[PDB]
Symmetry: D2
Subunit: 420 residues, 4 copies
């Protein structure tokens, strides 16, 4: 059988590895998001359409290079390429826009250039900020203050790039929306042979906290000049997914290299293979054991839904979400079932790419008069887009996660539904 | 510590010191035993049902009201003794005692009536007296049959045929009392509604020192199958003449509950002894202590690992509801059921939360006592015009009756299990509700 | 062979979960291993005759308990003499000889707050008569154990003190009592009067678990086969209670009125023997060994390090036995704490140690009486060969079996450090 | 006692964790490695690494096995490389603290079956006393039998490590592993023969199966590729080396990095540094439990002694397991249980001393003293040699506990004793 199911049913991790089969083809949709840096090699609308088709989920703009005018044109081109697929509403793909700051460049403070760039991000409607060189909780507070009242909804992903950031990780993670393991600077700031320890520790802690973690830098470096990566590069991408990374990133590979589309395609192919090789039997038991007891109905519904999905091998968990939170709480238990998140918020649809296994569907259908009927069409929309995209078939079982009243914060219902 | 820290701040340290919760949170079975505390008081309602044999010592309506208050859930009538006239009078007295509390859902306690057959004797199958007694049971509306000396699947088919078309709803609990019944256990369990480990005859039919192996094997297999299992005979034997049991007797009751028995039984202790009410009270006290001492962490993990994957929505909803109940330390799981099946599927995962089963069927309310942790509520209100409103009213009836009986408190989290359409077989919804 | 893997609940032993282990238990899977839980039989009018004591030793009695709550010093001295006479009547066959420990159970503190003056006199009687163990009644705190130890004096340094936990205070102060005691007795008679009867099983399971964790002997006592005082067969609750005490992890099981004053002393011993053998094969060693290993702290004591290596090696090859040379019994006790399925055959020259190792589950003491060889390595080998010959004669071993041999690098107690895999020829 | 500082080093807080997730969360960049590097480094000796002076630097950097790629050069070229390796190794024979045996491995050019050139190159290997053969493109058990037969009458002791480089080799892995001494995951050809994105699955599967079988597994090709031209590797390269060790590889290899690159010594130093870090990060608690649960019961005293010795080593945090071995088999059976303690293998065989580099955590000590007339005295002398080398090299201190594994009689195949010794 397909998707490494013989290896998935093994009684030990050792037997799981022994049962991995190169002929067991992946069937599930790719769960780990790809962040591609948009630069000289990947700026055109035509090239961006090819990168979206190849698998890009988040477009990163490196504010260490270019200018505000340059990045504004890149943002416009990304939006134009994304909207060129709006003619097919059940299959259109949202793409988040992330702003990566230049950093403090000396001074444990928020550069005035960073204040100006963060203000640019708010004015241009960016979804995420990758905050460079975060070394303490007060650095995150400074970024949040610089985003102002209009940028309240922007996610702050703190980049850990030095010894201080690693040592003060817990306080940084507590106030951040997520973390980026920025291996480039980290490998210069700490001994290169210790970076893998920092990566594995940060991924584990983010998985424990249920917060997004991005693995970044030199993942497919040789692809800047060559059409195929080295054996160490494919292994690095696969191991980042197996470590538990929610996102994988391409920097020079897409910003300035000769094969930007090929680099995205390679990350897509490796992530799909690595996701099927995840040993869910141990992973779910450990996530379940480590996750604290909770009296929050969204949290309680999420664990019940993921348990139910594993019991019936559910093809998907369809969840209605306003902010993306209910989808994030499902994602933290790493279900094998795809989490199809139906949302009316375009920003939440883009941001939800930070959470592994969450497939955002932006709902743009006319409302139903009775709230209960409106909820049911959003569920049938998740099922129709699910069927159109290959996630679901007639006869499949799905878990549907909804709330008892409109507005964010009221998820409390899990339903077992048979498709068609 | 960090996996229970926010909930310890919210519910308090006193909450986590009661009902053997420190022992329940242990990482190993050895650590679990080391953390058992005689000062950790049981809080939950007793979930293992007590079957009491009704005979000369426990027959009067006044005495039966005392036994219902002490905790009796199932009244057993041993057709190896008395007559049809004697047993019919016992049944009438049980029903009169049960109906004396029928004025309210707060006081009403359904009590199942079980008929224990005389058995095949030296014969190879269903005896003529058993056919007559089984017909008597159908005519008197008994809920359960404890079929004596079941040795093969064809013995339970013979009992089913002798109950006729009008006894289709009666549960057949096969009594395993000899070597053949133990060896053919799987085929017997497949066609039975449940099993009774009849240790009296078993201890004579096989070496006495092997009975505990048969008991533990049968309890384990019934737990795996999700079918009721009764532990029976000599549990509190000395209480036939003495007001207090021996140390081996209290240990035996506790170990039957820890083994996974859904029901515990009293035979001579209630049928002919000097302290029938005290024997019920003692079983009640021991079962509540033993239930809190169950190592749910390993038990739930093992029930999850052993149970095969399922495409039955009732089964899928039941495991999701039990997982949700454990996550928030839910006080109860309120389930709507017509036949008791949805409550049985919740019960097989052994939640620590009480399963409050709301049903319109009086027979299902009596029979669910066979499933550990199921508290039946008989709903007697007439149906609402809108089906969704009728469902909501039954859920609210469960909550109100739960609150008025101490099962629920304001601020508690309750898991509610319902279906998407009327009729049996459509349970598929789990809701997390905060009690206000 | 397939027959080997069908006996001693081996299908249930190989199960991946405790639930599947229970589902696989088979009443037709016969026990093969020797009974490892010791039987303490209380001595009284029904079991004092030398001829009756010979029958009780053959039935399986390992420890003779003298209850100082009854009788005079002259009575108990006569009990001791009869036990020793019955035990020594089998000394003519050194390969089959079974040592029997003598335990003195004290009267207790009564209304007083500590060690009574009668207990001081009885403890000194025990030292003078060479008793092996003291079952100290109503131990409520660590200072009660220190008072017993002081009353035994310098000549009773080798006597084991097993503290009886019989009330709420003893249960609450269990950790401090276990720390200074050699072991514990769950005295359920008094405990069931001192605390609610329905809570005794929790105290029993907690104390057995903690003793197992500490590697110290634990005795389950009182009313185990009570009905056998007057009836020839026990109730279903009684056989279940004995089996569950062994499954809980008790090192010893006890008979009080059943052997002291009942009509069936020999049969009560035989019944406990039969149940214990069945219950020992039903122990789920896969989880048990894993949990004992995980819970046991790291150690820099060579005897402790050799013991875990020897138990792990025994499980790897399904060793029939672990033969250990011991002066004080300590090396055998450290093997016993890991609950090997292999019998621990303890070869010793110390008659007191041979009697005392009965407190440890799975330890079969062999008293070696030959005078020391001039060459120490040859003396060690002769003792190992004596263990093998006794093992073969008693049915523990056969030619072709693998055995683990545990010895030390120099004479005297405290130097066990060697483990060897040996093929029986 | 050991002190709080002891329990903060070598990822001991992460090692004591109750779950793999907690283990990852407890990894600390400030927890320094203390144990000697246990994963062997195979360095390909070519134009960039051939001189005696350069070879001395590579031995000091950590090279344990010298690989000679018979796809390049000639017999005369490789014979000179072998001579230079032996000369560099013997330049440290005067000092017991620096003397390290180095195995010599011959990597064949490759094939329908065994090629004519491979028969001649295998014959060259036997004549030159090579220790290991890395057999290229092994696709079935009969390929291993052909190599074994070509190793003439004088070369049956040479270890055959089968290189799995294509779909057929992956599919017929079990039959190949059964007749091979070990496996090499030859990722270069494998990444061309099968889709590049599936190579990590083949690597993890082969490493797992070799670990289960107790046979050496080598991770090879492009581990530090960028170091062919640059002095420092990429983030993917350090991650790849660490993950190969964490996967369970016994050996890690350098090809172009040492054969033709600008930084051969630096590439060896980098693999040394990463492997030491990755070895301390191994989650032994789950690993040992799983190796124990998966390994079948055994009536072989060497195998029974080995598991008892590894269990005893974990119980006391033993600094080393000193084992007397003539063929290296007793050290290999200790190595399969992945002890945290170094396995110091004391042997009179120079060949076995070179070959045990294939087994993770085995530190060979060649013993050349003349035999004692009393066998028990000869064993004691060898045990003390391992303790004294261990004190000299920093493995041991007075007061440490060591596990000693010996047999009851001379000759190979009788290991059955495990002793706990206090270092005095
Ligand atoms: O965005 C840019 C860019 C924008 C405008 C002019 C030039 C560049 C450029 O040269 C560049 C960029 C990004 C990266 S990065 O994302 O890979 O870090 C680079 O390495 C890099 O060199
Ligand atoms: O039901 C009866 C009964 C009915 C009518 C007259 C007399 C008896 C009677 O004497 C009796 C009964 C049950 C048991 S039971 O506990 O074994 O089931 C007895 O042991 C027992 O003695
Ligand atoms: O040029 C050589 C060479 C030349 C002369 C003697 C020996 C080698 C040699 O050993 C080598 C070489 C090239 C490669 S490559 O071209 O395949 O990358 C190797 O891998 C490799 O090992
Ligand atoms: O995941 P979030 O942000 O909490 O949103 C979940 C919310 O979505 C719903 O399912 C539907 O709400 P809306 O009708 O407002 O879209 C709510 O019942 C629930 O509270
Ligand atoms: O447990 P059972 O016997 O399957 O009954 C559960 C049934 O009860 C309900 O919750 C309510 O059904 P009714 O309205 O027929 O009483 C159904 O939706 C569900 O199928
Ligand atoms: O278990 P103990 O009391 O520590 O005794 C074990 C001792 O027995 C021996 O194996 C043999 O000692 P003896 O020759 O003194 O009997 C010692 O090497 C070892 O120290
Ligand atoms: O690992 P190998 O090849 O089996 O060698 C182990 C052998 O070494 C010894 O420990 C010592 O043997 P020698 O004295 O012959 O070297 C033997 O007793 C044992 O059989
Ligand atoms: O900024 C980054 O992404 C880095 O340093 O790796
Ligand atoms: O029939 C019974 O109930 C018995 O034998 O125990
Ligand atoms: O003293 C005892 O043995 C008791 O109270 O059980
Ligand atoms: O031969 C090799 O080592 C390869 O192909 O990677
Ligand atoms: K930047
Ligand atoms: K009957
Ligand atoms: K006494
Ligand atoms: K080659
Ligand atoms: Mg940076
Ligand atoms: Mg009967
Ligand atoms: Mg007493
Ligand atoms: Mg190749």
């Amino acid at each position: 059988q397909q998707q490494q199911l013989p290896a998935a049913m093994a009684d030990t991790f050792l037997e799981h590895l022994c049962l991995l089969d190169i002929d067991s083809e992946p069937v599930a949709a790719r769960s780990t998001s790809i962040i591609a840096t948009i630069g000289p090699a990947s700026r055109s609308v035509e090239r961006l359409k090819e990168m979206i088709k190849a698998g890009m989920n988040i477009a990163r703009l490196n504010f260490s290079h270019g200018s505000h005018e340059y990045h504004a044109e890149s943002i416009a081109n990304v939006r134009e390429a994304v909207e060129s697929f709006a003619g097919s509403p059940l299959s259109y793909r949202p793409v988040a826009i992330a702003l990566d700051t230049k950093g403090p460049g000396s001074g444990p403070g928020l550069s005035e250039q960073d204040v100006r760039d963060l203000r640019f991000g708010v004015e241009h409607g960016v979804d995420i900020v990758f905050a460079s060189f975060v070394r303490k909780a007060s650095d995150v507070a400074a970024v949040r203050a610089a985003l102002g009242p209009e940028g309240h909804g922007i996610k702050i992903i703190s980049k850990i790039e030095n010894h201080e950031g690693v040592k003060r990780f817990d306080e940084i993670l507590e106030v951040s929306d997520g973390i980026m393991v920025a291996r480039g600077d980290l490998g210069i700031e700490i001994p290169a042979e210790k970076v893998f320890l920092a990566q594995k520790m940060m991924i584990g802690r983010c998985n424990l906290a249920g917060k997004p973690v991005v693995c970044a830098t030199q993942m497919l470096e040789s692809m800047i000049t060559k059409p195929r990566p080295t054996r160490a590069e494919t292994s690095d991408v696969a191991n980042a997914v197996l470590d538990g990374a929610d996102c994988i990133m391409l920097s020079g590979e897409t910003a300035k290299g000769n094969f930007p589309v090929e680099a995205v395609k390679m990350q897509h192919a490796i992530a799909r293979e690595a996701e099927a090789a995840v040993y869910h039997r141990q992973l779910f038991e450990e996530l379940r054991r480590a996750a604290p007891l909770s009296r929050d109905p969204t949290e309680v519904t999420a664990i019940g839904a993921v348990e139910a999905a594993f019991k019936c091998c559910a093809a998907a968990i369809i969840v209605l979400t306003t902010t993306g939170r209910s989808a994030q709480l499902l994602s933290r238990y790493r279900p094998r079932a795809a989490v199809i998140a139906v949302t009316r918020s375009a920003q939440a649809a883009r941001q939800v790419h930070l959470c592994r296994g969450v497939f955002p569907l932006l709902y743009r259908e006319p409302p139903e008069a009775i709230w209960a009927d409106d909820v049911d069409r959003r569920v049938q929309f998740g099922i129709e887009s699910g069927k159109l995209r290959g996630f679901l078939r007639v006869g499949d079982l799905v878990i549907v996660v909804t709330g008892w009243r409109p507005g964010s914060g009221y998820t409390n219902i899990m339903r077992v539904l048979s498709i068609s």
